[model samples]
Target: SGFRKMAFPSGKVEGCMVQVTCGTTTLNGLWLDDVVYCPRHVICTSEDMLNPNYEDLLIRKSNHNFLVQAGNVQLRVIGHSMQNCVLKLKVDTANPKTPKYKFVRIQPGQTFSVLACYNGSPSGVYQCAMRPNFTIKGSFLNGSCGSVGFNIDYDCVSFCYMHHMELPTGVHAGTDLEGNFYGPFVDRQTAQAAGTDTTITVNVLAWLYAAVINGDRWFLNRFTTTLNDFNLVAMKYNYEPLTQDHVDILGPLSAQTGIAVLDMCASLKELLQNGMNGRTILGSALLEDEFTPFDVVRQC
Candidate 1:
């Protein structure tokens, strides 16, 4: 049993780390070591991690409202909510005293282009997040609604960063940070679920922010062989881009989506051959006018 502790502002918690070990030379690139450890923020099962390109590999099954002009802000009833609930924004103002507003019912197909603005100059227009519960009226508030932009939007440009995007109805409908979480519902579901979890969200992004912005090598180096071990195990599960040895190794467990997985196995193999110390989780050759093994992930 592997156990590790995490620091709490007040106290502490036990056993966050999970350990995996290989005794001897293993197939599909599980390298030997004294011990390997990974601390996951959110405890997820194999089912939680899905292939990004899951749908293309298979096939799947897959509204609107008004426009209300409050101030420079346009609130449209893009139509009725998924449920017929009243729509409203709990807007934040520049003043320390935050106020609430009445519920505004939007009809199906109706539009409230501009969400009203505060009377005072630069009333902040910031507020807390809303968790979706459409059964109640007006609960269909977009996730991004919490990130209302007043007269300023200087620091808004990431995946869910919101801005006063041009509203379709010519009115500046206050678009939210994630007017839509803008991904697959289940993926969207997981994203929102992950967002609600303070421990997981804070823990995961702390390292990611450093790696992208500050060129944080030490933060990134934490992956090394341990990261590769998990990844190779996952790849082996997929039984991808098959080889003769891979063909002989298939069992019902790995037989789930055995689509001869991605051709990244060679890359995985190369990394293990060198003891799995690397600068990043994974990488692929980059070349112009040709398809790289990781072109799609890199391009996006």
Candidate 2:
């Protein structure tokens, strides 16, 4: 009913290994000169090894090649199961014209240490691509070898923002002569302190432009939370008439309310684009301007 325990020298092996004992007092079967224990019935199951500790995976730029550093890069090679696995290092050169290249091939159970010598200035954004051979039968097994790569640079920092600024109400309303069209407001000093530079700001703006042009749902969801009220103000004044009196009337209201006037202008543009004679479909466009600011007010 129970197994007996047998002890061994503790310090001799790196891991614990032991022998199991049978408690029966006598053996009933015919005998031979020697007895061999069947492992299926007697040996203890092998213990699972603990996972290793390693640094966070990241891309680091070294001499010309990007290095992908992971704690334990490994491959699991399954016998008789062929699978094509590709390991590629993708880089966005920040240049629109060039195509992305596949930098490396992942070898089975092998530490990838090949250097990629590329021509041109170093582009910051890079990531690893893995393609295992699906044509082969056995699965490539990875253990203690580290997942896919090590010491390769991925360059995620290039995508990070370096500066930002929040503009004031006057600029938001377009009443100020120098108001920037793409801004409601940004705190430049604070943004500069946060390491955001002009180039970074422009990159962020370009991304926003692309998102709007493509009508991305994810971006729309995020933009709605921040600009819903301003959009509503834009809706109220859109296409009513752009007279000096109308501008003057809205100017005072915008100045007093601390809202952007361009938001109203954008709302009007949307209205014209979708209203009665406009070319695009109606009702499908975002109607953020339809809701009043008071309707949107809420505790954060």
Candidate 3:
């Protein structure tokens, strides 16, 4: 009898072609199993053979699975093969904190590419592994290999004042006290008993009291003596009893040594004006020389 005709469904083989080999013999029983026609089995076998190698196929599948998972997640596999024929697969659920990689079975004619995607958050470490049954070795890849970082800045200021009591009178010399004075004076009893009748005695007692109270002999000798002398002058000259008008008269003289008080004021004003003008001139020159470069290169 002629060889049994073999039949297979369409799409069973890749490339639109199904290959069949016939034996030279015409025996009917010998060709029985040879005419097998399982379309699904042929397609599956053809796909497995034509696909990429085991490592490449695993990487492709892993990439597809990883893309399908949720954000902030990673996958890894590690294991060894048995007898060069047994396929081993291991999944590591515990991910790493940083990305790194180490390969042991990398040899000539082998190429590897690891893919990483950012999930719009702070970058961190992740780890995965893989091993094929053909080799007793394994490898690892870290996903945190390339990461970007950010920086934060904060600015503020604190103000402080330092007080010092090192002034000669424990007060700033330029400070105005509104005409108030603090010091001791003679007892009212002595001044009253001396009375306005005995002018000489009253004056001596006043001098002594002022000297003791101010703790300075010069204050009594100069200012106190001057006041007493002025009162005596007023008594002799009959000059309005040495009142506020008399004090005003002495004010200009008190500030004068040789030059008149008005002249001194004029001199001080001139000095201040000249000094301020000189500062302005110097400041203009300094700005021209020193600040010119800063203005020119400000954009830089």
Candidate 4:
């Protein structure tokens, strides 16, 4: 016979408390007893909980674009869902008009991207969050199972744009805040620091931004092709020394005539020095007419 529910005085159990009951009966000197209780439970498997390093690990594949002049920025997050838990992705803007963007539910093993971009007028924090979906089932006293919710937040930054930059010929071009045509170029120090005299166009700077600014290695590797060889010269920026892991990657990249990698950090420092000395720079860019499917263009 299957187990049967027994009538017992039931009340809410406190923290770390377990309720158990045992009954005994005797028939013709034969005694029998049984104990019943609900075991501690976690409805969602512990292993399915979102990884704490997920932001750092998964965003390697993400794409970020910032329109410095217009003071607009967008973040694209790419990630997969956990085994037993659904993943929720949301973004909140500083704009009251468009307070929050719709969130998406990512099923297990499903890949997703959450993109949020804000215009210049209402400038502030563009916050995004990711979490594992969970909910308790039934009553606590009725053998209900429960799981804890986990979440992480991400904030985007926009730099002040004082002037517009002009791009050199043969290089791609983008627009300024006022719809005026402008070109993109890496800072002189960026080229000097990297120990190169070759022209460092926005195409190269875009790749560098992924590394130095966003700290994303995967996206930077995309430019290591014959047409976009990043090894035109040797790297001399030892100020920000590369780790052994980085050396292993960049070393071959330099040797193989293929390499890559910030504009955000640079813009912050530029504005700090003096707002008058800076100019508009695109967070991401691509070659004109030869843009790839994923190439991020200036979003007016």
Candidate 5:
């Protein structure tokens, strides 16, 4: 039977043609399973990313996840084994006002490709997943080995401003009931009853805090350094111990002076998370609300 003739006809063998031989006198079962038909299989599990170019922009967490502070980001993966793998990128934003960010996948290269996140994307959690790429002809080749995924969290912070209050000729400074300043008086009560302004000006944080409470979070950004400067000014003038109201409105600190950057904006964070449903602040309302005919914002 081994000598019997049998025709194995073919026109053209497509990609990955295989033939095996371990002959022993015209062996009938001449070939075992063919190897090297396609590229080797790589597990889809969380593997260290191929490229290390964007190390500055990303913090690699366990399980292939990543973290990026609010900015443009670029992600990459191995191309050959991961080519058939599919990707799942999801944007989970905290603030509704935040604009939707996108995941742009450009063409692939010999070993890597881009997964880009546009600039100014909102602050929130982003989840991504990679799965095996199987095909109809997968009887032999599997695109990837298994599955790998990540949670690319984005921490987008808002803007904050710092302004140095300059002394003006005719104007005075004051605080509200909560010890926050809207104008030049001790409080609205003092402004109403005493009917006169004082030369003393409220601290910078007090003024900014008042603005935020009044729904003008225009400069509601980060500034622990600026806050420290304000506190230093207060300490120079014997205002080292901030009022209870000030502590409550801002983050709680036994002494508002010498505050750490990490604990700088606790209350402000809560307010922002709760949403900006309060009144809209205007430069006009601010001017007309408590300014006298000659009162000025005193920008110098």
Candidate 6:
């Protein structure tokens, strides 16, 4: 028989799908007996998929019942000649047009699970589907091997939060308790890759961290350079003396003294994470949330 005549048909996926060898054979009894096919998916009660010596012509439907609980789900399968087969379980909410699409995959003697709790919030019915994909001689010329459909009972919170306290993460790493993602707020960085002066590429944050990690010589070098630039700007406006506000507008960290940068060592990492703490790492006196390491320079 022709390759097309003996193997499964293949096509683009428009919805749920699978692929395998065509079942139409002229050699009347030349296929596996456990192979089953359906309109939506495929399955095999037990086939070594498609072994050279194993052959039978079987196609059919199968079903299994399951439940989702404790913010977790499990999937498994069992049968003879069932090696390297894939069992898939998809648990999604009822409103086909939204999120909550939880899925799991396992082996013939294994169970897979998601270590998350889900409380039922986006209220609606929920459904689950279990499809076991059996490998065939020509899976490319085929679709799904086998599958089962069922319902889900969600008994927990709607979604889950991470299992740790907040730390210095990137701008968009996660969200707050309100489920509202917070800022992409810009901050200063050390080892920053800036070749010149600008709000973004360069700032007080980088300079301060660099100030401590570096030395007083390194600190004073950038300080004097910044002051020189400030002097030039002031001279640019008819020798005008720049005020603290204007100086800050020129360079955010230009006002800090040598003492301020030294005090930041109390918990540099903690300061970086919590941010805006004018107090030390072990103090109970941070009155407000403001990036004010300079306050340490002036206050005790």
**lDDT of each model, Cα atoms only?**
0.21, 0.20, 0.20, 0.20, 0.22, 0.22
Q: Which runs in model 6 stand beyond 4 Å of their true positions?
A: 1-173, 183-216, 222-300
Compared with the true structure, the alpha-carbon lDDT of candidate 1 equals 0.21
lDDT of 2 by residue, 64-102 (tens): 222221112211111111011111222222222222222
- Candidate 5 per-residue lDDT over residues 167-250, each given as its tens digit: 223222221111222223221122232222211122334333334334454534455434555544445443333444444433
Clashing pairs in 5: 44-146, 159-221, 160-221, 172-184, 173-184, 174-184, 174-185
Please estimate how well model 4 matches the true structure, expressed as its whole-model Cα lDDT: 0.20
In model 4, residue pairs whose N, Cα or C atoms come closer than 3 Å (at least 3 residues apart or on different chains), thus clashing, are 167-183, 207-261, 208-261, 208-262, 209-262
**Total clashing pairs in model 3:** 8
Query: Candidate 5 has what TM-score?
Result: 0.17
Order of quality (TM-score): 1, 6, 5, 4, 2, 3
Q: Candidate 3 — which pairs collide?
A: 76-128, 77-129, 77-130, 81-133, 97-125, 98-125, 99-144, 100-142
TM-score of 3: 0.11
Task: Assess every candidate by TM-score.
Answer: 0.20, 0.15, 0.11, 0.16, 0.17, 0.18
lDDT of 5 at 76: 24
Clashes of each: 47, 61, 8, 5, 7, 28
Best model per TM-score? 1
Candidate 1 TM-score to native = 0.20
- lDDT score for residue 257 of model 5: 34
Global local distance difference test of model 2: 0.20
lDDT (C-alpha) at residue 183 in model 6: 25
Model 3 worst lDDT run, 10 consecutive residues: 25-34
Which is the better candidate, 2 or 5, if ranked by TM-score?
A: 5
